[PDB]
Design a protein around this ligand. Structure first.
Ligand SMILES: N[C@@H](Cc1c[nH]c2ccccc12)C(=O)O
Ligand SMILES: N[C@@H](Cc1c[nH]c2ccccc12)C(=O)O
Lengths: 352, 352
């Protein structure tokens, strides 16, 4: 909220929420109710465009630093699926095997590439439509992005990078060269095989609020390239070696909440209450629980001291395993042939 | 030749030159004798390798800022053909359409890409063997280079780039990102479809001395990647916005020497002599004239004053048009099918 000012994003008022629901014909995701996606840039443009019968596209991404996604990383992906189902628009997903090899001394491109492909399985396991979704790694799609990477780079000073991402002269040049790579897919030109070279297809970018810098930068260069400014919709972080992965079994999950999940309850049972703003388990349930009436009542009871830290952690565990089990079976149905449909660069479509 | 030592280069020795002629059965190309290629880094390593029956490869390049190559730009290319004929080794040639779009405000990728393809025709017109030569533009081969680009970038600080190329914070980030692109082909890993993934094939890089910075940098990162240091052999530039292009007609050529070619002769005929170190026409004939006996005698007569500036400029004109006519007919034999042979990324070969 102090970060929303210094970035210069606007809050998503109810009037926007009511408009999307109004235009879509579907109930708003709970990530809106609960201010999980709380922030945007020019999201009102997207609804303007969709109001006019015009199509647009979604862009989101993932950095493969681990073989499996955290559950926290499903927050933007699950939300994007909802947006794809609601607007029925194409989606574009970048796996940044280049970035994480660059920004993490303890990594190689062989590992990042493999982690990328496993990560795709977790991503597809969220139930995206392959007829509407194009997924790709930077190592494999770099040539298609290169022309827009070069155009963005020519318009930004090295000093502007420092100013935006806070790098220093001591940083490796790879760090300076990546932002353009992440910026590039927010322009329709970077996907000739779906949009046909058109430059007039608006892009909407769901992302954790910490990714905002890349898209602040690209919104500044857009006009100088005669391109549309991409719109953004921001989520808050999902708070914290080992945190909860989507391929964790029931025992792993229970083990981690009980030992590593910071409680807001009193040390002993001096609960005739608890602090919900610091309780990690409460904040997790806010993302997961589709039942509103349960949530308020859990929050009330755990606040007032008629629920111990022990019980709130158990409720979360069973929610996490329901989530993680449903994702794990969906993942079993994902083979190289299913991947191929998502990775297939060509889409015989009529946007031209 | 004090900067040339300071940089860390070595002058090419008669021993080194004799050592070669001994080892190939061919008399030495005159760019050696005339000290046009005067300098090297670990060229003695290449001869060591060739002494042992082992193969290596050549890497040279061209920046397409103009539709036609200057005659000066044929100096490294003509020399490389000689090296290819003498050692019978594979060659790899990079057209940097990315660089010149990056470094020249008055350029676009469309122009640079086209200028690249016309430039290839001039390059192929030097008589390279397509069974031994692989030519490519960065826009088209970037994905194959990307892994080594990324590996070089992770090992160099932004401050190291400033220090080596003299860039400033005000410079666009594209300028910082390009050196790795030019470095990458000096490692055999960057050509899996000829060397088979092998990292133990030495590379030799012919270049104008002003390109040295890129290969100073890449020689410093080689060990940290477990890669071989590339060797280089360096040429002095053809003495210098119109200069002589390979597609210039006779009239264009005569027009340029007479008007723009700095003479070392006296203003009027106060020649009972001339200064050969400043005379641009004399220095051009040193590169061109395959006849030694003529050259000494021209130099003597033009020195002593029994040849006017007028005649020396005419001799050069007729040499230039003989050169430029032979190149122009060889260029007429170059179609997209010929280009395709050179640009074809795959080479069924036994280096593995
Ligand atoms: N940089 C993001 C991955 C990513 C790539 N493109 C994106 C677009 C939007 C949000 C995130 C991304 C990460 O570290 O995981
Ligand atoms: N950047 C170089 C072209 C080049 C690329 N790779 C090279 C290797 C050797 C010599 C030249 C090159 C130029 O503008 O001239």
């Amino acid at each position: 909220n102090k970060l929303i000012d210094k970035f210069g994003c606007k809050l998503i008022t109810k009037d926007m929420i009511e408009r999307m629901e109004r235009l879509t014909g579907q109930k708003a995701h709970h990530f809106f109710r609960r201010n999980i996606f709380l922030s945007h840039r020019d999201f009102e443009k997207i609804l303007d465009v969709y109001e006019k019968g015009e199509l647009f596209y979604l862009y989101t991404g993932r950095g493969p630093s681990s073989e499996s996604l955290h559950v926290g990383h499903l927050v933007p992906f699950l939300f994007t699926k909802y947006l794809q189902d609601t607007f029925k628009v194409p989606l574009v997903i970048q796996l940044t095997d280049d970035e994480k090899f660059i920004f993490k001394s303890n990594l190689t491109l062989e590992e990042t590439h493999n982690y990328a492909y496993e990560n795709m399985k977790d991503i597809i396991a969220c139930g995206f439509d392959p007829e509407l979704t194009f997924i790709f790694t930077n190592l494999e799609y770099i040539a298609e992005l290169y022309p827009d990477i070069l155009r963005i780079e020519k318009k930004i000073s090295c000093s502007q990078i420092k100013s935006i991402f806070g790098f220093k002269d001591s940083c490796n040049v790879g760090k300076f060269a990546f932002p353009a790579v992440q910026a590039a897919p927010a322009f329709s030109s970077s996907f000739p095989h779906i949009f046909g070279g058109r430059t007039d297809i608006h892009c909407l970018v769901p992302h954790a609020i910490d990714q905002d810098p890349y898209f602040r930068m690209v919104r500044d260069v857009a006009p100088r390239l005669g391109y549309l400014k991409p719109s953004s919709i921001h989520s808050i972080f999902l708070p914290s070696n080992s945190s909860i992965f989507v391929n964790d079994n029931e025992e792993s999950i229970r083990n981690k909440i009980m030992k590593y999940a910071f409680s807001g309850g009193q040390a002993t049972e001096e609960e005739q209450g608890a602090n919900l703003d610091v309780d990690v388990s409460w904040q997790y349930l806010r993302f997961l629980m589709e039942d509103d009436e349960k949530l308020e009542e859990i929050g009330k009871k755990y606040s007032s001291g008629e629920m111990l830290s022990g019980e709130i952690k158990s409720i979360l565990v069973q929610e996490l395993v329901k989530l993680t089990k449903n994702h794990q079976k969906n993942r079993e149905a994902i083979n190289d042939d299913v991947i191929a449909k998502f990775t297939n660069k060509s889409r015989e479509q009529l946007l031209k």
